Design a protein around this ligand. Structure first.
Ligand SMILES: Nc1ncnc2c1ncn2[C@@H]1O[C@H](COP(=O)(O)OP(=O)(O)OP(=O)(O)O)[C@@H](O)[C@H]1O
Ligand SMILES: Nc1ncnc2c1ncn2[C@@H]1O[C@H](COP(=O)(O)OP(=O)(O)O)[C@@H](O)[C@H]1O
Ligand SMILES: Nc1ncnc2c1ncn2[C@@H]1O[C@H](COP(=O)(O)OP(=O)(O)O)[C@@H](O)[C@H]1O
Ligand SMILES: [Mg+2]
Ligand SMILES: [Mg+2]
Ligand SMILES: [Mg+2]
Lengths: 372, 387, 372
């Protein structure tokens, strides 16, 4: 094989690139844009639809949509469109000569596996492919053979304890809370300041607001109480149109939703209660290392100071008889891609791909038979 | 051969073909019926039954003039039919059956006017093609720009339309019911202040030329009130074509003030700059720079001396007062650029001429005679589904 | 205590009256009119600014402008002038004696509520007051405790689902489409017939036209096809001048914007889809019941025939196994006022007023620790 392609079709962002490298030449938000204004001006070739960085650049007129929601896919036509974009525009390589690696969260419905694999088969006629779980690559990038992980993304947050090459399937749970819900709650709390954001184009600027002007507190009640003298925490954000935004306690309130999901009408365990329950449900002989072999990955964990709060909180829930550690690599956002590239870089992985010859007689159902 | 383009403006008529640059012929949209009054009425050459166009405006002394178009719409249509007949039969003297014509129309006109204008153009002439376009998109074509808001001020009505990257925001088109005609009427009233009376019909064109030659837009209100209150430098002397001279003072800067302060002519609508600001502000947050960064003046009524500078200063000031709430910290971070091309008067014609060969050689883009007759008035939907 | 006061400061109209009654003591447009003529008529005591019904009477010369924009007050000076006019002309009772009650839109920038309570305590000396969302008053109006309230008025419209006892704040949806936008779109489409209305008094005339001669089409394309033969949809109106106005498909085209917001170029979902999404955000334990009760309230929802289309379209979206009923009270315009009066009449409500005694040591922020 000449080269191997790996691609993680994340809910918000899509990461793709040749295996065995470090810089992804294909990273861009998973956006399909369509011109909302029916009235058009004759000439200049008004495109039927826009996808990718072009769509983001012309976000002003279009009505942008996310093909992936909560991880499930609803816009399979947009899926083929964005896959075509990825394969041809910014890679300049014919898909039918290289294998592809695919990823998704655990507990994904089987029909999703079937449809994604089947379209990979016919629509592109790529030589071979493999599909696995994101957390596997997240751990394999770090070169660690055992340790629980927390893969928080734009639309999926799941915890996957990992043993020496295996895992306890009774111990993996996936939480729907992610960057999308964080954005929604950020909108609902910024409606206080008089700032209004309803259009999807305004969602794309609310996302930037969250990315650049947010942080995680260490003791929410105490810092909210001391925020009564809101002078050292309020900052200034420059909206694209030209005015200014005086963000306040909401700069730290919105990421707190991860710790307390009771603020978004989600009667669910917090981001630390899920970890505590997952480890407590694991084996007693591995509670010790699972207490201090947790890592961070994905784009959601880019919050400054979230690592210290998470560490202290899981230490508080855990018994104090033993030490607790946290792992926060400064490349949590591309950890899944790096793990995929590393796994595809394995000297003996070439025989775990699925070429044409299996599907020529087997069918799509065999992916659950061997691929996982 | 080449398709014909027609711009039947309220106060003027322009006509030409594709690939042209300057209007081939321009002439007021006037119809002259013969009349005898207390004048000398020299028999120069002859007085025909109905005289229109350049001959009408030249012999205007001996005839009464009626304007077929008012407020951007045609009031009486027989006179306008006479106008098309004149333009096609002697202004260009080429009247084939089957040629392609590209018409123009301000945005929010009544459906009946456009429908029956197209019906007349089809049945009475038999042209094989038709297309009606907004003056704003033609003004946008004139400079070749793609994104930006263009304002068109003419004799009949002033309208503004924002367009961002080859997409016309049909729900934010503007319509300000103050134009050159209202300014001329206010000028007549302001001259009636002093004692001069212009109640004839030729006097309307006389005072129109007076406002053309003398009136100017102020840049600082208080400064000009001081100038007209303490100094006599603003006085100008104008001699009528009849040969009589009158004195004009504060009228020079008070005539076009009605565009910026429509309450002078009893209009509740906001001024030019305020209406532009509201139109730009109502748009989405993303395109607001490109709306501000590219404002293109167009039309004859925008040729007022010192208008672009006043517009730019006033829009910056109003942004400062309305957004910053008096804080001068962020004022130097604003980019507004008003376009002042020399031919913004004929920008509509230039855009029409460009669009004539932009979409030529393919009749399946516009309406044909057969399609019109077999799909009735409702056939006139291929042009544009504007609101 | 002598009595109680309820003043629903709506975007367009104000319904102020004593509690414990079903008929408002005074309902009038919330307009402050200032003349635009310096040619003062010496004598006969004409005043600088006109408010209330006098503004409607003299609209021929004033410049009518509402002091509320999409539920947010922006001209506090005229707001306090309107309150002055109410209290000392149409109620003739000093605010120092009778406590008042106010209404606020959900998700309103709370600076509005803070300034409201501050200005009332400052310049009106009310003994006590409270602020409640119109949705809970609308629910209390019918005497029940289940359903989702479709309260659409002059400024904004909102849906707040609610079960017995407690509400569901995360499911509250709000849209700015309302009667003002309907009037604006009607004015925009009237110019296509040759009739031009520009002045504010002309806006009031068009609003009266919309009051008298508008309805919601059962099926949009069917009625548009019916508009081929101008037989029944064609009506006539008598202008105050003496003119005659001929109206066609604009009778039912302008109320359609409630269901197709793209008509006025607003990217959003029609109110039916908004209600469907809001109910879908609720859990399975609650929507089975909330489908049956749908409370319709507000001035905008008074359109003849809107309820039938609402019902048919909501059952179209909902699964076919559901039974959906739309509540159509014949007194929906004052429904919020009747709900407020019923709430004030209960003897179990005197406990959670907002007295000056607790306000003095707590400041204007107490409105947030008390109301919600
Ligand atoms: N230099 C100038 N100063 C003042 N006014 C001017 C000047 N040049 C032109 N005008 C005014 O512009 C008017 C001509 O505008 P024009 O006929 O191009 O508009 P129009 O095409 O009739 O507008 P519409 O398309 O809305 O009918 C004249 O009435 C004249 O008063
Ligand atoms: N610098 C940053 N600071 C804070 N949050 C970030 C940052 N960068 C990305 N994010 C968050 O990460 C999310 C993107 O996650 P992503 O990596 O796309 O997950 P997936 O690949 O599973 O879709 C966004 O919703 C965004 O809110
Ligand atoms: N009979 C009616 N039919 C249709 N629309 C109406 C009718 N009566 C009032 N409206 C509309 O309702 C609006 C008044 O709503 P209102 O109940 O005052 O809301 P708010 O109290 O929030 O201002 C008016 O702008 C008007 O357009
Ligand atoms: Mg992922
Ligand atoms: Mg013109
Ligand atoms: Mg209300």
């Amino acid at each position: 094989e000449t080269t191997a392609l790996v691609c993680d079709n994340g809910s918000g962002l899509v990461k793709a690139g040749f295996a065995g490298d470090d810089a992804p030449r294909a990273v861009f938000p998973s956006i399909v844009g369509r011109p909302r204004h029916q009235g058009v001006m004759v000439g200049m070739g008004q495109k039927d639809s826009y996808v990718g960085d072009e769509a983001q650049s012309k976000r002003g007129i279009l009505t942008l949509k996310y093909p992936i929601e909560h991880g499930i896919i609803t816009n399979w036509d947009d899926m083929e469109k964005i896959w075509h974009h990825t394969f041809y525009n910014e890679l300049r390589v014919a898909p039918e000569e290289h294998p592809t690696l695919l990823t998704e969260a655990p507990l994904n419905p089987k029909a999703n596996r079937e449809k994604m694999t089947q379209i990979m088969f016919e629509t592109f006629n790529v030589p071979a492919m493999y599909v696995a779980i994101q957390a596997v690559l997240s751990l394999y990038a770090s070169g660690r053979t055992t340790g629980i992980v927390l893969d928080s993304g734009d639309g999926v947050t799941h915890n996957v304890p990992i043993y020496e090459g295996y895992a306890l399937p009774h111990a993996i749970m996936r939480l729907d809370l992610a960057g999308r819900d964080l954005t929604d709650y950020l909108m609902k709390i910024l409606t206080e300041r008089g700032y209004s954001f309803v259009t999807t184009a305004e969602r794309e600027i609310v996302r930037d607001i969250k990315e650049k002007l947010c942080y995680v507190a260490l003791d929410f009640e105490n810092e909210m109480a001391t925020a009564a003298s809101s002078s050292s925490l309020e900052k200034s954000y420059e909206l694209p149109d030209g005015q200014v935004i005086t963000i306040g306690n909401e700069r730290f309130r919105c990421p707190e939703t991860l710790f307390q999901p009771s603020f978004i009408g989600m009667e669910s365990a917090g981001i630390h209660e899920t970890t505590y329950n997952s480890i407590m449900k694991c084996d007693i002989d591995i509670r010790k290392d699972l207490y201090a072999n947790n890592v961070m990955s994905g784009g959601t964990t880019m919050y400054p100071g979230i690592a210290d709060r998470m560490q202290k909180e899981i230490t508080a829930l855990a018994p104090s008889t033993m030490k607790i550690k946290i792992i926060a690599p400064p490349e949590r956002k591309y950890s899944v891609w790096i793990g995929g590239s590393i796994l595809a870089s394995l000297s003996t992985f070439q025989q775990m791909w699925i070429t044409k010859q299996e599907y020529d007689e087997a069918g799509p159902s065999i992916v659950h038979r061997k691929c996982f | 051969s080449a398709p014909i383009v027609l711009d039947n403006g309220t106060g003027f008529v322009k006509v030409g073909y594709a690939k042209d640059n300057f209007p081939r012929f321009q002439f007021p949209s006037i119809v002259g019926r013969p009349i005898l009054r207390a004048e000398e009425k020299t028999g120069n050459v002859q007085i025909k039954d109905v005289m229109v166009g350049d001959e009408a405006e030249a012999v205007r002394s001996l005839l009464q003039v009626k304007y077929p178009m008012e407020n951007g719409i045609i009031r009486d249509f027989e006179e306008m039919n006479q106008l098309w007949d004149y333009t096609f039969f002697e202004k260009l003297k080429i009247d084939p059956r089957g040629r392609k014509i590209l018409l123009t129309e301000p945005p929010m006109n009544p459906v009946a006017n456009r429908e029956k204008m197209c019906e007349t153009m089809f049945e009475r002439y038999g042209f094989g093609g038709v297309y009606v376009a907004i003056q704003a998109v033609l003004s946008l074509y004139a400079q070749g720009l793609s994104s930006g808001v263009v304002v068109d001020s003419g004799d009949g009505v002033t309208h503004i339309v924002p367009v961002y990257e080859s997409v016309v925001l049909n729900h934010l088109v503007g319509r300000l019911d103050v134009a050159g005609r209202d300014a001329t009427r206010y000028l007549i009233s302001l001259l009636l202040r002093k004692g001069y009376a212009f109640n004839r019909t030729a006097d309307f064109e006389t005072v129109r030329e007076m406002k053309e030659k003398l009136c100017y837009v102020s840049y600082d209100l208080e400064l000009d009130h001081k100038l007209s209150e303490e100094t006599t430098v603003l006085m100008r002397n104008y001699t009528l074509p009849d040969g009589r001279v009158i004195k004009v003072g504060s009228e020079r800067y008070e005539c076009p003030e009605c565009l910026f302060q429509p309450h002078l002519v009893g209009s509740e609508q906001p001024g030019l700059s305020e209406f532009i600001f509201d139109t730009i502000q109502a748009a989405d947050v993303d395109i607001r720079k490109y709306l501000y960064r590219a404002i293109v003046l167009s039309g004859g009524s925008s040729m007022y001396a010192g208008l672009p500078s006043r517009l730019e200063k006033e829009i910056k000031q109003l942004w400062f007062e309305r957004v910053l709430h008096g804080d001068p910290a962020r004022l130097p971070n604003f980019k507004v650029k008003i376009e002042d091309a020399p031919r913004r008067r004929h920008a509509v014609f230039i855009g029409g001429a460009v669009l004539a060969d932009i979409m030529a050689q393919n009749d399946h883009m516009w309406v044909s005679k057969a399609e019109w007759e077999e799909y009735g008035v409702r056939a006139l939907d291929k042009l544009g589904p504007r609101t």
